[PDB]
Amino acid sequence: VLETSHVFCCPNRVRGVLNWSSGPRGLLAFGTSCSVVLYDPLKRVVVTNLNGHTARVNCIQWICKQDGSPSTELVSGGSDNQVIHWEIEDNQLLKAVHLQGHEGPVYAVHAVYQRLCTLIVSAAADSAVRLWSKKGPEVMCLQTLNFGNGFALALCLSFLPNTDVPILACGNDDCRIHIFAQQNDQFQKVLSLCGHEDWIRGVEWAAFGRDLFLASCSQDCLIRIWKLYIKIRLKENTFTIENESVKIAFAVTLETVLAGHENWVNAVHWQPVFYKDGVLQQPVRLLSASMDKTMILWAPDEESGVWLEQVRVGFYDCQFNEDGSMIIAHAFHGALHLWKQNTVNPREWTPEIVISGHFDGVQDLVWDPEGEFIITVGTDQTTRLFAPWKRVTWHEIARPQIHGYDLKCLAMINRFQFVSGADEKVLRVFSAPRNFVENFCAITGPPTEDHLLQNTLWPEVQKLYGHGYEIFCVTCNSSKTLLASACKAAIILWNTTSWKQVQNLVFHSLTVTQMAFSPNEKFLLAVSRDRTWSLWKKQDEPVFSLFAFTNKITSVHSRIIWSCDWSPDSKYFFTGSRDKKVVVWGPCSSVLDVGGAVTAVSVCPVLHPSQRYVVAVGLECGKICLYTWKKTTHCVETSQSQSHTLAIRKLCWKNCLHFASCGEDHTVKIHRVNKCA
Amino acid sequence: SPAELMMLTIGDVIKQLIEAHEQGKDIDLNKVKTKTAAKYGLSAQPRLVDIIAAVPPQYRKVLMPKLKAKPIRTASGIAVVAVMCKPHRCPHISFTGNICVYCPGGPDSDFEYSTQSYTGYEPTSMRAIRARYDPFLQTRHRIEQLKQLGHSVDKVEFIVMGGTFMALPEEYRDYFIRNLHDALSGHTSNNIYEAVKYSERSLTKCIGITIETRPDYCMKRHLSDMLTYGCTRLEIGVQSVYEDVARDTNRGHTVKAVCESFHLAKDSGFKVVAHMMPDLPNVGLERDIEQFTEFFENPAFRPDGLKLYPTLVIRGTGLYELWKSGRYKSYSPSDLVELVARILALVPPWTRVYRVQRDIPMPLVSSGVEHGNLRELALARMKDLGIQCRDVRTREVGIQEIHHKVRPYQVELVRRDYVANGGWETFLSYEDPDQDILIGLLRLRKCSEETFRFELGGGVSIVRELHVYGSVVPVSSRDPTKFQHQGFGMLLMEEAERIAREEHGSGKIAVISGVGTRNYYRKIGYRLQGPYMVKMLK
Ligand SMILES: CCNC(=O)CCNC(=O)[C@H](O)C(C)(C)COP(=O)(O)OP(=O)(O)OC[C@H]1O[C@@H](n2cnc3c(N)ncnc32)[C@H](O)[C@@H]1OP(=O)(O)O
Ligand SMILES: C[C@H]1O[C@@H](n2cnc3c(N)ncnc32)[C@H](O)[C@@H]1O
Numbered sequence A: 001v002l003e004t005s006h007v008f009c010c011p012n013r014v015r016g017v018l019n020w021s022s023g024p025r026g027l028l029a030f031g032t033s034c035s036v037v038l039y040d041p042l043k044r045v046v047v048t049n050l051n052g053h054t055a056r057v058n059c060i061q062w063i064c065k066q067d068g069s070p071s072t073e074l075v076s077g078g079s080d081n082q083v084i085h086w087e088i089e090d091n092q093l094l095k096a097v098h099l100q101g102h103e104g105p106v107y108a109v110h111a112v113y114q115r116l117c118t119l120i121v122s123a124a125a126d127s128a129v130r131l132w133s134k135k136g137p138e139v140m141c142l143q144t145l146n147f148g149n150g151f152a153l154a155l156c157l158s159f160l161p162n163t164d165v166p167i168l169a170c171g172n173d174d175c176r177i178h179i180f181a182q183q184n185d186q187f188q189k190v191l192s193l194c195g196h197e198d199w200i201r202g203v204e205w206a207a208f209g210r211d212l213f214l215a216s217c218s219q220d221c222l223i224r225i226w227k228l229y230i231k232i233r234l235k236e237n238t239f240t241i242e243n244e245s246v247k248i249a250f251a252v253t254l255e256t257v258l259a260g261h262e263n264w265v266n267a268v269h270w271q272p273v274f275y276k277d278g279v280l281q282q283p284v285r286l287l288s289a290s291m292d293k294t295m296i297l298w299a300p301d302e303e304s305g306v307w308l309e310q311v312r313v314g315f316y317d318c319q320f321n322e323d324g325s326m327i328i329a330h331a332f333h334g335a336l337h338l339w340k341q342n343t344v345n346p347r348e349w350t351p352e353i354v355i356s357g358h359f360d361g362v363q364d365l366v367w368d369p370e371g372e373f374i375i376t377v378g379t380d381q382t383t384r385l386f387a388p389w390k391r392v393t394w395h396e397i398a399r400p401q402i403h404g405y406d407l408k409c410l411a412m413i414n415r416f417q418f419v420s421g422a423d424e425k426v427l428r429v430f431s432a433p434r435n436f437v438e439n440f441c442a443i444t445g446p447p448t449e450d451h452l453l454q455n456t457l458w459p460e461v462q463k464l465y466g467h468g469y470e471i472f473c474v475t476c477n478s479s480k481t482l483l484a485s486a487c488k489a490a491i492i493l494w495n496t497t498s499w500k501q502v503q504n505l506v507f508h509s510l511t512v513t514q515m516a517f518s519p520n521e522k523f524l525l526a527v528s529r530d531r532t533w534s535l536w537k538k539q540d541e542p543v544f545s546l547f548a549f550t551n552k553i554t555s556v557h558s559r560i561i562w563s564c565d566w567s568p569d570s571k572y573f574f575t576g577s578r579d580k581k582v583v584v585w586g587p588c589s590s591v592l593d594v595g596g597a598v599t600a601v602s603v604c605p606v607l608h609p610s611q612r613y614v615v616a617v618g619l620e621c622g623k624i625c626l627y628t629w630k631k632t633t634h635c636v637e638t639s640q641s642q643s644h645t646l647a648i649r650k651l652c653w654k655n656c657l658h659f660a661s662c663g664e665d666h667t668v669k670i671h672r673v674n675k676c677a
Numbered sequence B: 001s002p003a004e005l006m007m008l009t010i011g012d013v014i015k016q017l018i019e020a021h022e023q024g025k026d027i028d029l030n031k032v033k034t035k036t037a038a039k040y041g042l043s044a045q046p047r048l049v050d051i052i053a054a055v056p057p058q059y060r061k062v063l064m065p066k067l068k069a070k071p072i073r074t075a076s077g078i079a080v081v082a083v084m085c086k087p088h089r090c091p092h093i094s095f096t097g098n099i100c101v102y103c104p105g106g107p108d109s110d111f112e113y114s115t116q117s118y119t120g121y122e123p124t125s126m127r128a129i130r131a132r133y134d135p136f137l138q139t140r141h142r143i144e145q146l147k148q149l150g151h152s153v154d155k156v157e158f159i160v161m162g163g164t165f166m167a168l169p170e171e172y173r174d175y176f177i178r179n180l181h182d183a184l185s186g187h188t189s190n191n192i193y194e195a196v197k198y199s200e201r202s203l204t205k206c207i208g209i210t211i212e213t214r215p216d217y218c219m220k221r222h223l224s225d226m227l228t229y230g231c232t233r234l235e236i237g238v239q240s241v242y243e244d245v246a247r248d249t250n251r252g253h254t255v256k257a258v259c260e261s262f263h264l265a266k267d268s269g270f271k272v273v274a275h276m277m278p279d280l281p282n283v284g285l286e287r288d289i290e291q292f293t294e295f296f297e298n299p300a301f302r303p304d305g306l307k308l309y310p311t312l313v314i315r316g317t318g319l320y321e322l323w324k325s326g327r328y329k330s331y332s333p334s335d336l337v338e339l340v341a342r343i344l345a346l347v348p349p350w351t352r353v354y355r356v357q358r359d360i361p362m363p364l365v366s367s368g369v370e371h372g373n374l375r376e377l378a379l380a381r382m383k384d385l386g387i388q389c390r391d392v393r394t395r396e397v398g399i400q401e402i403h404h405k406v407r408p409y410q411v412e413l414v415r416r417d418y419v420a421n422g423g424w425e426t427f428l429s430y431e432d433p434d435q436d437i438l439i440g441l442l443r444l445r446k447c448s449e450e451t452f453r454f455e456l457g458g459g460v461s462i463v464r465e466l467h468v469y470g471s472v473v474p475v476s477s478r479d480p481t482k483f484q485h486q487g488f489g490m491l492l493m494e495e496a497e498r499i500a501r502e503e504h505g506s507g508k509i510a511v512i513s514g515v516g517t518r519n520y521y522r523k524i525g526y527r528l529q530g531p532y533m534v535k536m537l538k
C-alpha cells in the first residue's frame, strides 16, 4: 500500500548516459549508480526506474522506430561486463535479457530493429566486440571480434541503401575507422578510413535520399564528413559487394572538413526526422559538443560548401529534440542545462527548469517541524533544501553552503537554524539569510541552474571546538535545550544559548555510533561500536548519572549495533545491528529476526488505538521491509520498483502518511501509505 | 575606453607582424610596441600575455618561436606538473603531540586551511584551495594555464605534494591515482588497472611520478605497491648524519633505518632525493662542513638527488620559543653564503641539485634571510674564491645556453663508476668537456645479491634511469635544430647492453619505465613482464 511520491537524482559522469525516445512525446532516459531512470520533460516528472544492472551503468541506447512511434525497447551496458535488453510497456517492463560473454566493463552498445531478429553490437573494455541475434526469447552471440591492442570507442550500425544489407563502421583508438559488411551472413572487414589523427570519439550515419553521409566527432578537435553512394576529380574509394549474385558497387569519399572548436569534440547528433502531418522531411541540422563549454549547431547553406555555423550559446554530450525545438545537455558534473528555442526569433533560446540530486551519495536529512521543506547533506560537500512548488511538484530550492571537507552529520536548531558536522574538529551553525526567507514565503504564499549557486549562501554565527578528533554523530533534544555529539572516546554536551560544555561523559571504549534523546526528555540512549549501549538519567543542568548499562555479556547483539530509536511515549527502546537481530526493551520481546543486516530503524510518531506498534526497517541491500509488534509481524514491504540498490542511511517520518528514504544511491525517495492501513 | 584602445594596438601589432612573417621580415617586438603605444596615446606598455591571447591558430602554428614566455620552464627538457594532496596527520603523533620540532603548521596548527610543512600561501596552495584539493580540476587548470604560454605538452610528469602519502587509507589513494591518470587519458575508469591500460595508449605520454615518504614506510610491501603506480623517485628527509640529532629533533627513528631504506630502494631500482638541513641546534659550523663532506665521502649514502633547506625559526614550534628564549642563534648572512659556496665545491659530478632555500612568505620568519635568491650569491662568492662547481643542472645545455649562450662544439662519451650501498653503480654520458656542457646521461648498475623482486634473480642488471636534457620536442617532430631526436639514446642503449652482457656477465636486462615510454622500448624489441620492461640477452 506504499506509493512513491518524489525522487531526486542526477545522471552519472561518464559520456553517453542520456537519450530520448524518438517517438512523439519522446521520453528521457538516463543512468545512475546502478539503476536506470525514465523521466519526462512534459510535466518534468520522473516516469519510473529500472532496478536492474548491478554496477555503474555505462551506456544506454534507445531503439529505432522506423514507423515513427514511441519506442518500447532499451539497451543498457553497465560496468561489470553485463548488457541488458528491456521491453518497455505502458510505462513498465515486460522482461529483461542478460547477455553474457564480456569480461571487462561494457561501454559501446548499439541495437538495430531489423527489417523480429533484432541486431546487437557491443564492445567491452576487453579490446573486444560481440554481435548478437535476438529473435523473441531466442538470444545468441552471432560473432565475436577483437583487436591486436587498443580499444574501439565509436559504434553505429547501418544498412546498405535500397536494401536490408547491414554494414557497420567502428572507430578504434588507432586514429582510423574500419568498416564491415555482413555479406555471406558474416561481417567482413571491407575498408578503413585514414582520416584525422586522434581517438575516435563518435560516429553517426545519416541516410540522405540515395546516399549516406557520415559524421565523426573526433578527439582531434576536427570534424570530417564522408558519404557512401552507389556505382578534374579526386580518387574516391569504392568496392563491390555481393547481393543475390549481384556485385553492387559502392563509392565513398570525403565530403567536408568542419572545424570550429578548440578542445576535444565529444558528441554529434543529426536532426532526427519526423512528420509534417505525415510528411517525412529530411533536415540537415547538426549538433556538436566539446570540452570548452561550447555549443555549435553547424548547418550548410544553398551554396555553403563549408557548412555555416550558427548561434554558439553555451559536458560530454548534448542531446537533441525530435523536432529540434528542445535541446538539452549535462554539465561536467551534477546538474544539467536545458534550453528551448523560441518562435519569435530563430536565434532565440531560453533555459528551462530541470531536476537534480547529490549525484554522489547522501548521508543525512531532516524533516522540518512545519512540514513543507526538507534539508539533506551528502558526500558531495553540499547541502540542499527541497520544497514543493505551485502553478504540485517538489523542487530543490537552496544550497545553503559549500564546504571544503566532506559533511556527514546534521541536526536542526530552530525555524531557520541548524548545525552540521564535517571532517574537522569544528562545529558550525547556520541560519537562513533574510532574502531567502522572503523569496521562499513569496513562493509558498522556480530557481534556475546557475542563479542558485550565486545567491543561495548562508551566514555562519558560531564555531565550536573540543573534540580530539573529527565529529561522527550529532543530535538535539526536542525541547531544543541540549545537544549531543561525539568524535571517533568522550561525550560533549552543549547548551544552545551558551554554546558551552554542560557535562562530559567518558564511558565507552570504542567509537560512538548513535544517540537518542528520549521523546519525553527523560533519558538519553547511547549506542556505540563496542557492542554495548549506555543509558544516562537526568536528575532534578542536572547531571546524567548512568541509570543502567550492559557489559560484554548482557548485551544481546553479537555484532556492531547501527541504529536505535525510542517509543512515542518513551516506554521502550529498540536496537538493530549488523547481525540481523531486532530487539524490544528491560527486554520484553523475542528476537524479531528478518535475515538481513539492519541499517536503519524507526517508529510511527503516533500509535493506533489498537496499540499495534508499527516499525520501518531499512536493510543493507536496498530492500525496505516494514513490520509491526504490539505488546504480547510483517505488514507490507517495498516493491521491486520501489527498492534502492545500496544500504539505507536514515528513515525519518513526517510529524505534525509519509516518511523519508535517504539511500546510499544518492537518491531521495519519498513514499506515502494509506492513512487507515 | 582605454581598453579597446589597447585592443586596437594589439590588432595593429598582429597585422604588422603577420605581414612581416609573410615576406619573412624580422622586427623587434618592443620597437613596434613602443611605436604603437605612442601613436595611440598609451601611457603604459602592453602585456605580452594579451599579445599571445589573440593570435589566430593558422599563425600560432609558427609564431610561438617568437612568442613563448619564460622559456626556462622547458629549458630542462620535460614539462613539470605539481599536485596537492588532502591535509591529514603524520603518523608519529601517535606517541605524543609532536609533529617535528622544526615543522610548520599542520592540520590543526592555528591555520584555517593549510598542510603539514606548508603555510598555505604558496601559489600551488591557493590553486589547491580553489580546487578543494580535487586532483582532476587542479591538474586541468594548471595544464591549461601552462599551455596559455604557448608551450608544448607532448611530454609531461607529475609531482605530488602533501605531508605523508603512504600513511593514508588505500581506497582514497587508489581513487586519487586513477583520477590523475584519467586526467590525461580522458577516459573514465573503475579501478587502477583499467586506467593504466587506457593511459597506455593515450597521447599525453606520461613518463612517471615521484612521491615523498619516510623510512618507516619502506618495507618491500610498500615498494611493490608503488611498483603498481609507476612511481620513479622518492623523498625521505635525512636532516642529519648523526643519530643523536634525530632524538634531539624528536624525529622518531634511526639513521640506520634510513641507510637500509636507501640500500633496498636502490636494489629495487627507484631513484632517491635527500633533504639536508644546515644550521641545526647543537651543531657547529665545522660540524656542518664535516657532515656534508661525509655525505659524499661515505660509500654508505652516495645519493642521487639532493635538496637543501636552511633552518628557519617560525612561530608556533618549540624552536620558536627556544630562539625566543635567546638560546638558539642563527648565522650571519655572510656565514650562510660561505657555507653554501663551500658545499657547492664538494658535490660529486653525477649528483644533481634541484632546489635551494624554502619558498615561505617573507613576513613570517623570525630569522629569514633577506635574499630570496641565494644560488646567485653563492655563485658570486665562488667566483670570488675562483673555484667552480660541477652540478648537473649547471652543466646541461638548456641552463648553460640560457645563462651564458654557449654552443656545444665537440661532444664525446664519458664513463665512470663507484660503490654505494653495496652496489656496483655505473654512470654514462655524452657531453662536451671543453665547455663542460652536458647533453645525455644514463645510470646503470648490477643488482645486489640480495633482492626483493624475484624477476631479477640471476643474470639480471637493472638500468635505473636514462635522460637527455634540452627542451620539449613533439614526438612527431624531428629536427627544430636542437639535440633531442638525433638517435643519441640508441647508442647509449646498445653500449649499456654490451657492457651488461660482457662486464656484468648477466643474462637478461630489465628496466623501469614510464607508462607511455614502454612503447619506445617496443621499438628496440623489449617486451613487458610485470611492471618491468625486459629483454633477453642471448
Ligand atoms: C622513462 C621516463 N622518462 C623519460 O621519458 C624522459 C623523457 N624522454 C625523452 O625526452 C626522450 O625519449 C629521450 C630522452 C629518449 C631522447 O630521445 P632520443 O634522441 O634518444 O630518441 P632517438 O632519436 O634515439 O629515436 C627517435 C624515436 O624516438 C620516438 N619517440 C620519442 N619519444 C617517444 C616516446 N615517449 N615514446 C615512444 N617513442 C618516442 C620518436 O617518435 C622517434 O621515432 P621516429 O623514428 O619517428 O623519429
Ligand atoms: C621537505 C624537507 O624540509 C624539511 N622542512 C619542512 N618544513 C621545514 C621548516 N619550516 N624548516 C626547516 N625544514 C623544514 C622537512 O623535514 C623535509 O626534510
Ligand code: MET
Binding pocket: B117, B162, B163, B164, B212, B213, B214, B215, B235, B236, B237
Ligand atoms: C615534507 S617533509 C619530508 C617528507 C616526509 N614528511 C618526511 O619527513 O619523511
Ligand code: SF4
Binding pocket: B090, B099, B100, B103, B104, B116, B117, B163, B164, B214, B237
Ligand atoms: S614527518 Fe615531515 S611532514 Fe611530518 S611533521 Fe615531521 S617534518 Fe613535518
